[PDB]
Structure formats: C-alpha cells, structure tokens
Amino acid sequence: MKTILSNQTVDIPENVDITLKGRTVIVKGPRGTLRRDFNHINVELSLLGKKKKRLRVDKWWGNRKELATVRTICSHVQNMIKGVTLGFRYKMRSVYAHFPINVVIQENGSLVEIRNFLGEKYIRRVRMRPGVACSVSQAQKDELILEGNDIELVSNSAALIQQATTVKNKDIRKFLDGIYVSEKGTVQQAD
Amino acid sequence: VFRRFVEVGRVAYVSFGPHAGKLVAIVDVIDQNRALVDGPCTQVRRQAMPFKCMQLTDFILKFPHSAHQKYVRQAWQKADINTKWAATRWAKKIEARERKAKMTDFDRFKVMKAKKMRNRIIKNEVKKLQKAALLKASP
Amino acid sequence: QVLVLDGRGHLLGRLAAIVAKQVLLGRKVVVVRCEGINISGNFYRNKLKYLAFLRKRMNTNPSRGPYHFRAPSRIFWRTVRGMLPHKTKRGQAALDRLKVFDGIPPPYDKKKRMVVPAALKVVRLKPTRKFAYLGRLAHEVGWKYQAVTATLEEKRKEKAKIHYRKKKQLMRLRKQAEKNVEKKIDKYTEVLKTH
Amino acid sequence: SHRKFSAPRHGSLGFLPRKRSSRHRGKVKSFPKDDPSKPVHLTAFLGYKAGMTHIVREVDRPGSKVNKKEVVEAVTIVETPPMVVVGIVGYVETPRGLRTFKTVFAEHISDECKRRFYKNWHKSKKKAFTKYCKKWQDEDGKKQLEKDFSSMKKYCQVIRVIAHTQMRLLPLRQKKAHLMEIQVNGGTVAEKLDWARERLEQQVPVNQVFGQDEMIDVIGVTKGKGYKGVTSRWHTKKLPRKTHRGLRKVACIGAWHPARVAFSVARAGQKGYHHRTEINKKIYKIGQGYLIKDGKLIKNNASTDYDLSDKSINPLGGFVHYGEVTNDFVMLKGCVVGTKKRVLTLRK
Amino acid sequence: SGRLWSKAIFAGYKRGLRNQREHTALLKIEGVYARDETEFYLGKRCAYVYKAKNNTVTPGGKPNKTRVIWGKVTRAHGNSGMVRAKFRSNLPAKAIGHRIRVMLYPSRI
RNA sequence: AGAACUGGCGCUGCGGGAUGAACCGAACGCCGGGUUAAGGCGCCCGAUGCCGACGCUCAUCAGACCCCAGAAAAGGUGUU
RNA sequence: CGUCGCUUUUUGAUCCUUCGAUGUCGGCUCUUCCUAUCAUUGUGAAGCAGAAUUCGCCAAGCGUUGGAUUGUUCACCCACU
RNA sequence: CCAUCUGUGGGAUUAUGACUGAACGCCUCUAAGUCAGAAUCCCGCCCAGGCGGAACGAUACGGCAGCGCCGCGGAGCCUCGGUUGGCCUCGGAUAGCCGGUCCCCGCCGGGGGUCCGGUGCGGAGUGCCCUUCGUCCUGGGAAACGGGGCGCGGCCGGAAAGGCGGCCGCCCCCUCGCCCGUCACGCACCGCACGUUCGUGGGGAACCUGGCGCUAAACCAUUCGUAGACGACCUGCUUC
Ligand SMILES: [Mg+2]
After folding, report:
1. Cα–Cα distance, E29 to C184 (Å, whole number)
2. What is the C-alpha separation between C155 and C105, in angstroms, rounded?
3. Distance from CA of C10 to the nearest CA of E (A)
4. Which UniProt keywords apply (chain E)?
5. CA A163 centroid distance within chain
6. Is C96 within 8 Å of chain E by CB?
7. Which nucleotide is nearest to E34 (CA to C1')?
8. Which of A148, A162, D131, E52 has the most C-beta neighbours closer than 10 Å?
9. C67 vs A182, C49, C74, C97, D118, CA distance in Å?
C-alpha cells in the first residue's frame, strides 16, 4: 500500500530523561539506567521540547509489516520507562505434590540451586542473566521473586526456572509440578 | 533527521532528464513518485516530473495548493530565488564544475604554472611551522 | 598498475562478477578483507546451501574430486573461478591476475583501498531484508582462523587511527598555513577556473 | 541389493591410508593447551620401550566386586634417560596457521646431537655449528643474539623447546640422538621464555615433567608386519574351502554402476608400521636407576613396600631383544605401540 | 617527451556466440564508457606494438626488435563505449588483454 | 498401435532452444561492407556499464522462457 | 460412499536398444546409498495414573542376529533380542 | 574375544517449549528483536600431508685449480610486458563530516555543550609532481632549508607475507634545484610509422677487472633388522 506516515508518541515523566545517540536509546532514571539499540528497524525517533519530554516515533515510508513495528518501538520504550522508575517484579510460586521443592541461592542472588524436585537426586543449578536479583519470599510459602530494571532480563530468567522444572517421560496433565510464574508486578509500587 | 521534505511549494533542483540543471517549484504531488512541477522564471514549464529525477533544495515558497502559473511566478520573484540560488554554496559548486569542463588547453597550462607555484609557497611555509613546533617541544 | 578492493559491505556475486571481467581485461586486481563480504538471504538459508555444497562428494575416493574450501578468501576465489573460462589457458591466466587475501596483509595495508558501488549492500539490497556474513558462515563451517584474524584486525586498525590522527594534524597545519596567504595573485586563476 | 543380513564395516575409515608412515619418531600432532596462571612446565618426553612384565597391586575401587583385593595387571616399562634441552623455538600465529618465528640453539651442543644432522657421520668432517658457536663468544654476534630473544618475547605467542635423548646411556647400537621439539605450556611468554634461556644445555629429568598416577598418552609407530593379505590387514571373512583361485580374499569388491573401486573397500597392502596415538595410559611408577659408587650403586628398582629385596626391574637374564636397564624409567598399564627398542613420545 | 596516444586494450574478436570473426577486432578504449562519447575516436589510426627477436625499423636509423600492426577504428559497438577496429592483418590472439596504442592522427578536432 | 490434412526429417547445413533428427527462425557457389529474423544483452559469452517505467513476491525445498524434461485435489488471520 | 496423488522394491503393456553372444535363478562374500523409522537420541499428542502401548515430528549417526525344513527369492517355525 | 589394554568435547542450531511484542486499542513463540534445544550437522581429538609455505645448520684447495659477497666498467645471447606515481581512519546509511572551550587516561587519548559544511569541494568526477626542449645573457617576485650522492657515522619504527620506512651528525658540493620578465643560440635533417618511460628490466654463458671471505656434503658400496617383494626405511664404521 505504501502509506503516508504513522506515529505514536510516548510521554516521559520528570525523574526519567531519555537521550538518544541515534536509533540507540539511552534511558536514565532513578533506579539505574538501561539502553537498547534499534539499528535493525528502520525508523526515526524524535524527542521534542524542553520541560515536557515527548518522544515521537514515526515511519514516513513503509508496508504493512513495516507499519506493524512502529508500535513495537514505542511499547519497548514504555517498558524502559516503567522499569527504570518502578522496576519489574515477577513473583513465582512453587507447586508440588508429595515431594517438597528445596530451592536455595548460591551466588549473591544470581545462581539458583534447585534440589529435591520430584524426588530426584539431580540438582538443577540456574545461573541468571546479568541484572536480576534472586530472593526467596518471606511471609509466604515456596515463592520466588525476581527483581530488576529490564523486562527481558527479568522475564527470560523467569522462563529458565519454569523450563527447568519440566516433567519428562510422563503425563504432563497430572504430575503438575513446577515453579510457575504467578504475578507480573513492579519493585516500587503505585507510581 | 529529515531536515527537508517535499511540500506544496518546495523548490527542487532537477539533476537529469530533459531539464537537467534547472530549478523547479513542486506544485502538487500526484501519486507516490511523480510530482506536478513548473519553473516560471527558469524556463521549465508545467508537467509531472518523477521524484527520482529531482534534488530537494532548502527554499520553500508560500503559494496556494495547485494555483496557476501566475501566482507561482509572483512567489518565485517575490522571494527572488534566482539571486538566492546563485548566492548559495551548492550552485557555486555546479558553477565551478562547468568552468573546469570548458577549460581550454591554454588556460589549463596557465592553471598548471600557477598551481605548482603556490604549492611551493605553502610547502616552503608549512615546513616553517613544523620547524617552530619542535622548537617549542625541545625545551 | 594494480587496484585494491576492500571487500566488506559488498555482495558475494555482484563483486565477483565485476572482478571476473576486470581480470579478463588485463588488470591485476587484489581483493582485500574478503571476510566481511555480505551475501543475500538470511544466515540459516545460506548456511544450508553451503552444507549442501559440502556433500557433493565423489563416491569412489573423495580425495580426488570436489575440493571444498572453507576460508572466505577461497570462497571468494572459487566464485570468480566459476565466472571464468578456467579450462582454457586464457582463463587460467585470468586467475593469475587475481590474488585474494583474507584480512589485510602488510603489502596491502598501507595502500588506498577502493570500493565498487555496484556491489555494496547499502546500494543494492532493500534495507528491510536479511543478509549473511561470509565470515561466520565460514566460521560455522570449519574455518578455524576467525579469532586469529579478528585479533589482527584490531591490531591493524589501531595502527591506522594513529596514522589518520596525525594526518588531520598535517592538514590542519597546511590549512592554517594557507591562511598566511601572501599568494592571492595565484588564487585569482584557480577560483576563476575551479580551484 | 539389500544384503539380507546387516553387518558393520570391516576396519575403520578413520585411519584409512594404511601407509608406511613418514617418520620413525612419533610426531605430536597437537600439544595440550597452555595457560599463563598455571606453573611453567614441559608437556612431552621421549622414551624407549623395553618390554613388558606384569604386576600385583591392591585394588581400591568401592562398589566393584574386586574391592580391596590383589589384581595382576600387565605393564610395560619405558626407559627414559633425562633429556637435554638444546634449542628454543618460538611460533607466531597467522591466519594461515602457526609459523616458526626463529630458533636459538645452545652455546656448545653435544656430539650425539650433531650425529642427527648427518646421514654419513664417518665420511663427514663434522663441521656443523662450528660457525654458529663462534657467535655466542664474538660480542657482535652476541648483542644481536640477545636481540632475537627480545623480539621472540614481543611477537610470538607459543614457544617450544628443542631437546634430545642421551643415547650414551642406552644399550642400543644407535648413538644418534632423537631430536624432539616440545612445547612449554606455562605462564605468560616472558616467564615462559626466561624459563628456557636459564636451562639451555642442561638436563631435564622425567619426574620433573610427569608424575606418579598422572595419566598420559603414548604416541608411536606400530609393529610393522609387512605386505599382508586382505584377511589379515582388515580381518575379513575367509571364503569356503571349495573356492577356485583363492581362499583368503574378499570376493565382491564392488557393484556394477559406481563403475570404479571405491575407497571404502578392503584390499591387500602394507599392514603395521603406522602412526597411532593411544589415549589414557596410567603411570604406575617413576623409578630412578643405578646410583652412586660411594657405597654401592644400589639396584633397588621394583622393591615395593612389601617386597624389600635387592631387586631391580630388569628381569633375570635381561630384557628379551632390548638389553639391561640402567636409567630412569616409566611403567605404564597396558599394551603400548611399537616393537621393543622403539622410540615413542610420552605425552600429557 | 610524453604520451601522444590514448590507452586501449584489445578485448576480443567480433563474435556471435559460437563462431567468431577474425577480420574485425573490438576494443575498450579507456576513459570512454558510453556510446554517446565515442564519436571522437572514429577513424583514428590505432596500433598494436609488440616485440620479436629479429629486427626491423623504418625511421630510426638502426633496426630494433620492435614491430607493429597498424589499423583503424571503424564504428561503435554497443551501448557501453566499446569500439570495433579493423586492422590490416588480424590480431594474433596472444594480444587478448594486452594494450593497443590508439593515436590521435586523422583529426577533425 | 492405427488413419486424415498440411508441412518436415529421411537426403539438409546454418542462427537460436546449455546438450539434441523432427521445435523456432532460416535453407548453402567463394568473399567484403550493411542490416535483421528467431533469440537475447550480471559474468563465463558478442550486446542494458539505460541515473529504464510501474507494480508483485521472502521460500528452514524461492523462482526463472514453445516443444521440454517433474506434479494435483484441499488448505493458509502470509501478503496484495 | 466418493475422490486426488506419488513411487518403480510386484506384475503387466510396449518392442526403442543388444541375435559376427552384454554369461541366465539363488546362496556366499563385501561396499555404499535411499527413508515411506523397527530400535536408539530429543520431542508433541492419546480414550497417556504408573507400567506397557498407540498415533505424529527433526532424524538414516548407528545397529537390525543364531537355527530346523526347502534349490529356493518368498514362506513357516524354534530361540534370543 | 582363546590372553591383555585403550577409545576422547565444543559450536551454531533441527524438532519442540518459551521470552518480550505488534499486526488486530486485548490476545499471540514472530512480523522486527531474544532463550533453552538433540544419537543429526561442522570443527576438535585422531589418520594422511599440496607443482603449499616457514625457521635453522652446513656449504667443496691441493698441487695448481675452485666458490660466495661487495665495487666495477666492456660486449654479444635469450624472454618480453608497460609508457608518471596517490605513502593507509573506522564506519554509518531513518545518517554522517570538520574545527573546537570544559572535566578524565603515563605531554599525548575519552566525553558533552558550541561552530561549521553537506547531492559530500578538509570532493581518488579527487589530490601532488607535472605538458622539464635545453642553455646563455639578464631583471623582478619567492626563498636562506640548500638537493641529488659512491658519501662516512648514528639511531628506531615495521613479523599477517616485516624485506620497507623515518630521523640525525659530519661531507667532496650546489648556492643557477620554482613563478613572471630580458637576450639569442643549439640537426632548422627540408609535411609523415614502431617516437617518449619504467630500465645502468628478467634469465643464462663466458672473459680484462678491485677488495672481502669461504674450505663441505649427498648417493652408491659396506653393515644393521626397530624395516623389507624389489626400491624404500631405521642404524654402525676414530688407529681405541
Ligand atoms: Mg595439529
């Protein structure tokens, strides 16, 4: 079709300041900073105006699979804005039958050492992506909490745990055992 | 990023084609790759030139959407594009590119003798600034 | 005498056909840094048809027969050979004017390198489509010299900064020197006829 | 077409050109990786296999049915007199592989090293290194000799060590040194290279390179058997007795339409004398041989903590086809490639 | 003192695909790479200079080992600045890729 | 396998279809210049090295030229 | 009940090639290839509780035997796997 | 296997499960961007080492001979091809280029504000020599390093194929190594081709020709048996 442009904008609150080197975006905020390069995605970005901080992503030329990626851009900025002010917290809970899951942390809140999963002798050590924090819950049974700024480093690491607790050579519809994610939240609440 | 657009009234240079080397005024974009243009004060009349033919310049003209030749003629010489186009650094480069093409054999000799002269002058002078640059760094 | 082609950013087939014609016309052509030649189509696609190339193997003894080269220099060399009449002695002599080098050797690191804008990826592919590097489909297929080459590139390119850093030192100087004019009698005739 | 009965391949195609190998001394195809943090050390060593005996050891392996009992094991013993380091080779890497940078040899080299550099030592005037020794002592040749270690230290990334064997200490009639070139895999290259200038023309024992119960590899050239037929070279099934023109032959050496004899078929040629590398041969004992004459040399090999005799590992009557061992030795569990009196390079 | 001739390589014989024609050569005169700008070189005498081991000259007073085959530029050949020339003998096919020597002689400029 | 009608091959080369009995151009004394048919013009391989026009399509088995040398029903929120 | 295909390991149909000759069944022996996968790796689905099975996916790396009868290919049986 | 011993790990990923996430305001493993993933695949380990290369040793006396290196002039023999060199940033492409005050890496590099330019003119559509016919007379402008070298001495840079480059002190020497102007001369060979360079090229044979050096080793024959069809292969041969 080759339409004339589309554009979404992303409003920026005051404690976070987005600066851009190009199609690379640098996001500094209160609880750290993080950056993403979009040198594959063929769009211009424009932060415009002092004292209000609006980011304008627009694509002038394009087709229907090139128009679909202008929202994917602006929805990745809002995960960089939300994660650098609030952060991400994926609470996940252990579900077990007869055998209780023994889950500890070896290395400074990075390595996760899972044993006594389904009565097996084999420990399952999970080393995580750099930028998340491991923490066994308090005032709750068998809950594991991951905290960090960047969603794709939180969420991929929360996927490695759930994938490691995979029941093999069995009926997966019974034998419902695993450390499944149960909540998608923030580190700081209600801002 | 994208500091100059096409637009109703945008002055464009025409690089190749049947009107190669003349300015035009973009009047109406017609479909996606073809634009209605004219130049009333630069000897190119009204037609649809393709966009890959043209070169965007940085002069805009505030005339209405798809007017006649007359109002574009008024806006061309109210804004006085032709003196502003001569007094730019890019039409000096296309002026300079044709002066070098019509350089005769006798002038090309005279350029050669006056080129190899002044490059002696700088080389016998740029050596002096090297000579004083170590003389700072020797104490 | 001899032209020197930097090979990165170029396409495999678009560059090697232009090398194949310029080498039939008597020139001596040297393509340098043929590690980063791009090749169209995504990487898993092009890695398939190179693995299909590896099993084209004569049954009775694979020692004689198809010689699968794996360095991206000889990948590029073999592409030129299929666009030459190499079974004739005019096509044999055409290959002897081609000398292809991976990385940048020291006879050819201080020359000025040329590019072919016919064959560039920036020119010729639509930017929203995927391409493959010849360096890492060589590395995926038995080329065991990627690390020892990419070490010698950054040893090469670090020595090339300190040359260019001091070059723009030199031409800041002869531009500061030509401010000290004293010569505008000679500046008449060049600006008159394109300085 | 579809054989009716599946059998596997006779022989391995991984060792295919069953060729007389181009070397009598085994070449190390690939040295062990070297890291700067680990101490500085050699990696291989030359030895001469002398024969086999067996042994009696107390096994200790929990879980098995043998645990805490006596087991006999067949062991080979390899007489390894201490090597003498002679030269230092550096290798700088290219994108065409490793390349020899340059070599520096010792000041005065031995006489049995020089015997390696000649195919006719008797008809010779022995003139090797006579002009190369004079540069260690003439000072103009010396202040550039130290220059070639500093350019060695700067550029090349893996350095090795040229050593040879002391063939004066063996009962063989050979007297030519076997000149090997082995790799120092220690720390960084400056400590790796000052570790070799310090010990040119000095001996390197075997217990300094290897250790007890430190599992190594044997590299050798196999027992050469000559030009032998199909059923012995490849262990192919013999034909039944009634067969005209021949029993011990492979019958069908291929189909019709490939129309050529394949490489993958078994036929007659040279068996043995091939280069092979064994993997995972355990060391049992590093013995030392035939010490001082102050009181007595002391034979005292093969005297374990339960035997306590004046034994020595050379058996009663001397080794068959080898001689009588007077040197430092290594004993290795299992069979080991080669005839007796044959060079084979032990390697980590 | 200096070069009074423009450089050109002998690219091949005029040919179809299978059969080739020996009587007409074709050239790639250097620096000219379009059919519109080849009109200068038409009619120009062009030469193929080579060596042997016996001797001949016309003007030099002593015969040297250099000898030559003359010939002239006939017409244009396709859209890309090629040029076909018809010499007085045929080129020996040793000359493929080697230069020839295109003079400026029969001048209308 | 067997008929009809016209042409062809057999008796017949040449250009094009990579290769070829019959297909498409086209028929032949020995040559020079000119031009074309059928076919083509990234490089083998003569000629697009045109600032060619407009769209369509991404394949982890793409596709690519009469005869002609490989495929169907059915299905696809893949795009148009 | 229909109906659309593929393959040339069956048999036909054909008679183009070989009648101044291409040695004609099977077995033995040995190599290599194909996948339309029996097992083995990693998986998805069951009317998958477990165990055993069954249906599908990437997949030909590796294996797929010993005998009684019979010229047998095929068949049938004993036994292991 | 009728005795004994040994048999070796990485990468990208297939199937498939997923991550964020649009298209389609939600959803969704996908469209761009990610993760895990295997008897398959490629490599390692291992077997052979290319009309593929390195590094190093030794380089022929005797009695006349002989052989390298450097410095040479002198001819003829054989193979021909070219007619000025560019001596270097990295790269990006919905982007880059130059100059720049301020705070950080043993008197140099990392950053940001600022100023420029940009169908790139600090433009290989370009740049430097140059289209140098020579010299003499003879003035202006430009320039006080001289520039070639058989110079001698010195340094230190460039290992991926360094086989090249930069700097310095003395020196027979030039003080005409440029641009404009004055003066008159040279083969002015009588209209004409292969001219003009790289080039005192490449390769071989010899001779008059200065200095500096150098004084071996392969193969056979003999022996060995770690080897063997034969060749090949591994070895010995001192007046102790
Ligand atoms: Mg190796």
Report:
1. 40
2. 12
3. 23
4. Acetylation, Cytoplasm, Diamond-Blackfan anemia, Disease variant, Ribonucleoprotein, Ribosomal protein, RNA-binding, tRNA-binding
5. 16
6. no
7. F49
8. A148
9. 57, 16, 11, 22, 39
